[PDB]
Amino acid sequence: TTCCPSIVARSNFNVCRLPGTPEAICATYTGCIIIPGATCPGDYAN
């Protein structure tokens, strides 16, 4: 599951993913994170 730190970061992440870029590269590009569970923490609420 992906968790983003702000709405801007999530919007940038979704654009990064349009061409098919792996989530891990979009994560470091935007500040979003990938976790194995489904419950994002409060500081990555977007």
Short mmCIF file of C-alpha atoms in Angstrom, two decimals, residues 2-19 26-27 29-32 45-46:
data_model
loop_
_atom_site.label_atom_id
_atom_site.label_comp_id
_atom_site.label_asym_id
_atom_site.label_seq_id
_atom_site.Cartn_x
_atom_site.Cartn_y
_atom_site.Cartn_z
CA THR A 2 1.23 3.53 -0.65
CA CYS A 3 0.96 6.36 1.87
CA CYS A 4 1.82 10.00 1.02
CA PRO A 5 2.83 12.87 3.30
CA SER A 6 0.64 15.53 1.66
CA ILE A 7 -1.98 15.93 -1.09
CA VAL A 8 0.64 17.46 -3.47
CA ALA A 9 2.88 14.39 -2.92
CA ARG A 10 -0.04 12.03 -3.75
CA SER A 11 -0.95 14.03 -6.90
CA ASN A 12 2.74 13.87 -8.02
CA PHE A 13 2.82 10.15 -7.25
CA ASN A 14 -0.24 9.49 -9.45
CA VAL A 15 1.38 11.38 -12.37
CA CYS A 16 4.66 9.45 -11.81
CA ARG A 17 2.67 6.22 -12.13
CA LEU A 18 0.99 7.14 -15.46
CA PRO A 19 3.76 5.73 -17.65
CA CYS A 26 7.73 7.10 -7.50
CA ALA A 27 8.13 6.83 -3.69
CA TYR A 29 10.60 10.90 -6.23
CA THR A 30 7.65 12.19 -4.16
CA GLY A 31 8.26 11.39 -0.49
CA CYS A 32 5.43 8.80 -0.49
CA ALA A 45 -2.24 10.43 5.80
CA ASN A 46 -2.69 11.30 2.12
#
